[PDB]
C-alpha cells in the first residue's frame, strides 16, 4: 500500500525499494496465498511503468508461465488477470495477430464467464485493450461499440488521481 502510494505520486524508484522488502516478509510468513497477491501487484506496476521491467528480480514472462499453471481451483480471478497480461505483452511484442486474438479470446472468455459487474476493474481493462486492439487493425466501427462501455474519470488504482483529467486533456 505504501509501495502503491509511491507509484501514485510518480516516485517510481522509491516504490521499488519498498516493494523489495515486501517479498522478503512474505517468505517469513511461509504462506502461499499472499505470494499470488505479490506477483499480481508486480506486473500491474509494470503495466503502468513498462520502462522498469528490467529492474525487477523476476522477468514478466516468468510470472505468466507460473500463473497459467498455478492451479485448477481456488483461483477464480488469477487466470483472468494472467491472460490479460499476456495479451499486452503479445501486443507490444508485435506478435502475429493469430496469437494476439487467441490470447485476447482467453482473457475475454474467463472475464465474462464470472460476474463482470463485481470485477469492475478488469472489465474496464478488457474494454481498454479491445478498443486498442481493434483500433490498430483499423476497424473503428468495432472500436466505437466497445468505446461506449469504457468508463471515464474512473481511471485505476496506483496511477495518480488526476490521470483521468490529463487523459481527457490529451484528446
Amino acid at each position: 500500500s505504501l509501495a502503491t502510494f509511491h507509484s501514485s505520486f510518480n516516485e517510481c524508484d522509491a516504490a521499488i525499494n519498498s516493494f523489495e522488502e515486501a517479498t522478503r516478509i512474505a517468505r517469513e510468513n511461509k504462506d502461499m496465498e499472499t505470494l499470488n497477491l505479490i506477483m499480481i501487484w508486480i506486473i500491474n506496476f509494470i503495466e503502468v511503468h513498462p520502462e522498469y521491467a528490467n529492474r525487477f528480480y523476476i522477468t514478466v514472462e516468468q510470472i505468466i508461465k507460473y500463473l497459467k499453471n498455478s492451479s485448477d481451483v481456488e483461483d477464480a480471478n488469477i487466470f483472468s488477470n494472467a491472460y490479460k497480461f499476456e495479451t499486452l505483452l503479445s501486443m507490444v511484442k508485435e506478435s502475429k495477430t493469430a496469437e494476439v486474438s487467441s490470447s485476447l479470446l482467453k482473457f475475454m472468455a474467463i472475464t465474462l464467464q464470472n460476474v463482470p459487474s463485481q470485477n469492475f476493474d478488469l472489465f474496464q481493462s478488457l474494454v481498454s485493450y479491445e478498443v486498442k486492439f481493434w483500433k490498430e487493425l483499423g476497424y473503428e466501427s468495432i472500436s466505437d461499440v466497445y468505446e461506449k462501455f469504457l468508463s471515464k474519470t474512473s481511471s485505476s488504482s496506483l496511477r495518480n488521481y488526476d490521470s483521468s483529467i490529463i487523459n481527457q486533456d490529451i484528446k
Binding site: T97, S101, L105
Partner: protein, 50 residues
Amino acid sequence: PLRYEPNNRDFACNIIDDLPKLIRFVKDSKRINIVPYTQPNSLWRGPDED
C-alpha cells in the same frame, strides 16, 4: 476452382482466418454438447480429402 496466387501488388490481407472459428451449440438427450461450426452447405462443398 479459383486460383488466387500470391502477388506483391495485392495488399488485401485476410483477418477472418486469423480470428478463431466459431462453434455451434447442439444439445443431445443426455446433456448439452458443443461441436465445431460447419456451414449448412459445407458438407458437399468442403475441401475434399481427395
